[PDB]
Amino acid sequence: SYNYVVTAQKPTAVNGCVTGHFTSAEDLNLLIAKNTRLEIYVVTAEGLRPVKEVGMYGKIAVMELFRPKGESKDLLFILTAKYNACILEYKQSGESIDIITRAHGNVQDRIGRPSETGIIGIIDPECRMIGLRLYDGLFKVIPLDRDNKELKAFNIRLEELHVIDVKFLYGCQAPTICFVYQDPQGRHVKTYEVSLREKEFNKGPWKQENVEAEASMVIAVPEPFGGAIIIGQESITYHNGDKYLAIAPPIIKQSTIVCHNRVDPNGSRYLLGDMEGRLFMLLLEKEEQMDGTVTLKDLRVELLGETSIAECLTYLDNGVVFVGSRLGDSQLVKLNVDSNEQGSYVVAMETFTNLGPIVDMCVVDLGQGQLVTCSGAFKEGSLRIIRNGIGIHEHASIDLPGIKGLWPLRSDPNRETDDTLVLSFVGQTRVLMLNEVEETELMGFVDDQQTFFCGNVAHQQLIQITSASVRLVSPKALVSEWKEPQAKNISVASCNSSQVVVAVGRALYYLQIHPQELRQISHTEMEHEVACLDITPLGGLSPLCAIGLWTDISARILKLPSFELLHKEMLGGEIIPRSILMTTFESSHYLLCALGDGALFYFGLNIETGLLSDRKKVTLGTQPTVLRTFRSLSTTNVFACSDRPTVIYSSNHKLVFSNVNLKEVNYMCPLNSDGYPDSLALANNSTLTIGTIDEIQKLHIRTVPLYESPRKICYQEVSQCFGVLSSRIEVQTTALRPSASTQALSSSVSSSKLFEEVEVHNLLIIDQHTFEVLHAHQFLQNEYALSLVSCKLGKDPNTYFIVGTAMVYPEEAEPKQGRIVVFQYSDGKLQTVAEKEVKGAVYSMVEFNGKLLASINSTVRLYEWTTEKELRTECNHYNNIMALYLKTKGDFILVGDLMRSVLLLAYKPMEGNFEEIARDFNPNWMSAVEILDDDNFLGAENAFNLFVCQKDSAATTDEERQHLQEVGLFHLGEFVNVFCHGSLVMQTPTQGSVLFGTVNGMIGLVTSLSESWYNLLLDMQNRLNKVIKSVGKIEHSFWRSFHTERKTEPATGFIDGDLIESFLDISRPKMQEVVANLQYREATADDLIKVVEELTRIH
């Protein structure tokens, strides 16, 4: 009735990517469209530098960069699926980033009918206009003109009603479109001139030609070529009027080309991507003329190699191509001049995780719930296991007890990577070198004292601080040595590249590092014994020393070199600070201080003043924490070593904490080796581990590639494994590549006697710990597995995998034969127990009070499981068009129809048959359904909306008792494939928890509220909308309105959790402006903070 929707994982599929100079005129930008998100990157020496991510109030359909005559940098044109048009500008003054809406408006037409091949947005190369293909029979033109307050769009009638693709041509006196269209006669290519003065078309530069029936793409070739390239199924053609050139290369005949991009600015070369993930170069052979000009001599296509299945491609720089994938992981690849041994020219540099499309999923407690998805399609198919926490990819484990410290080291000065690992023990030190394994000795370093710090310093020197002395080492030799006057022991030590501060009891001594010299600068005596030290220079000579003391349990900031106190903080308790550290996170300075009881304090720190502000406290573990900075994927983060190891990092200018999935870590240090780039070295009581850390974030994701399409998943606790339906393409049969189903330990084949490229379906049994394919059962020829359940039935104590199938024939168009199969996974093999024929496709199955509920075509059926191990029909319901989705609670059954909305059934135990309680009388093209509770039913449909249905709790008569009333509506902007009860949190302002999985790989969470909470948060929304500005000037209320072609309606009974959470990220003054007028009475900007913090804990 009152629902709350929040993002648990942002969409991961790439819908579009574009390159240009957008931030500055000089820098080179990659812009990526992920549904609602626009990511802005700068190409650098190290690769991609993130600059800005923006969330649009719309699904990005068009994304083009362009530069009008009087412009210093590119402008960005965006069209959303709801026809919000904007022109955007990146602006920067000092450090402040803003995106400016140069122009905006909504381009929707009521009269218009959305086209087959969807929204197409093209810009004239001379920036004279924007052209849109939104609807069959209409071409919308937005004239681009600076000196106007109104960019008035107009429609031009288009006689060609079925347009496949359109581009603007280069090198034309008038703006000229080129397009492919379909009519009874076939496919054709035509041109028109677009005159602004006439608001009309004119005969184009050249005539019409019959083209390939499968012609699907138009490329506008730049000068000096001009003209267009038309990509077909098995043919590529160039046209420029009198010139016509066609090639039919065998290489492209196997698969369809789905995306292209220009490599060379003059259009001599293009990248092409096909459905199988093949990458081609299309070469245009230039011909120089006596006259200054150039004509196309020939066309060649060349197979470069294999990438992910690309939605879009863009060339970046220095042979680097970005592959944006919808169906698989996105990639950076290098094109080389030399092939490799396999004949491949393509080399993968980076992969980006794409969960999409999530086709199915389930929650399992592998008290923290792990989510296992069916992800991807075709060769990109995979399982993904999603957890809260951060994982270590262990590459090495070494039996070494008693480690008391850990330092990384560059032995060679010209090497910019670590080659050495120095280890500490009670009174000893050992040096280790990476090829691989095995130790050594480093000249200048002692081995018979305990190292308290060591590593690289200024002037190409090295340092080692023990309990005895400070050793400066250059050709490696001792070049300076500092000792305390009376040769007393050094007790605490800290060091940067330039400075050393060491403690001798209550004595403090400050040293500087010079060419071959350790220069004592100043000395002081502290009030109490020194507990810990730090001198990290913050944005390489610190004016500050951070110190923790015994006795008073205090943290202090001292000026260097005077040792003047700038700030004292009483931490309190009877436990000494163990570790202290100064750090930058997001150009923001902090002091971190960890107590021996497991508590951590963090302050804001001002470099100039030395002032600590905002004592915040967190609890990490029971054991004392040791803090160490590390670098991971270009960001600086702190590892907190304890019985509960943690990473500290920054999100939106605030400190975040994430659990690392290890038992215990005493000490760690970063290790940037040749063999282990940006690795980590960890030490417990007995082991030295080396490994890579997963992306520093909330979600930790594991990938299990299948190399074929997963379709359904379910868990079988008793077998301790998963059942997964999958299908592979085989060719006329013989497979394309090895995949999960062809590589099982054991395998079986259906022997049922009940009954171009082909699909071959399988049930995979997959180990829950290792994710090894233990067994694969292949179905019958032409049999498609549709549904899967794991369950016990009737009085039978066994647990089965049950599969519903459908027989699919080439010379037939809908299922009329089907089968339900009961398997038992025992002793390593899948046994067929029972088989039940049916007269159609078994779309869906659920276990239902020890019985099997199934949907077959338009029929919902309940089977009992007899003593004789057979399924026997109990009762049927036939009032459906196509029952694709089933959910049950108690005796209640929610029925999702592809075309006929939702229906609520009940099983009557005494009558032994179904009763239709109520149904939703609005047509809705369903994608997924869930039961929120007894009276509340959640549906996701085909227009990217959510809605909630209710039984009428005011129904006086029986006719009224029978309507489900649509009490919640919300435009989500995603396509939901699966709904799931569960939580990624340990586990109140919210009741219930439904996770969902989407085509774009987004994971969301729906939960319920009290009327009270809803009313508060809806008001909040409305206030947040008046304070928060939307890029493109799109209204939030418009975005979230329920939208279909039949009706448009404001969202009700749904709170945008993402909006609500963004209250924590706005400025304090703007925070207070939101809370301007409120009741509890008055404004509690801090109380609203405390409220929202609660809401963020649900995921």
Partner: protein
């Protein structure tokens, strides 16, 4: 290889110091999220001609017919 030589270079220094993680991770994936608190007024507004195509057309033709005399 003929077709792979002379692949465009916009800045030779790009990707020079590119070293990926041992599990194919290199780029930073968490950009700061833009959340405008204040906004610059739009210079121009996009709008559609309310007039029906056929109207516009029939009006035009006649207007350039009486402009003949």
């Amino acid at each position: 290889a003929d077709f792979l030589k002379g692949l465009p270079v916009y800045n030779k220094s790009n990707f020079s110091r590119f070293h990926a993680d041992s599990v194919c991770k290199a780029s930073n994936r968490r950009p700061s999220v833009y959340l405008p608190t204040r906004e610059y007024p739009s210079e121009q507004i996009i709008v559609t001609e309310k007039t029906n195509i056929l109207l516009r057309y029939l009006h035009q033709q006649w207007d350039k017919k009486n402009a003949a005399k």
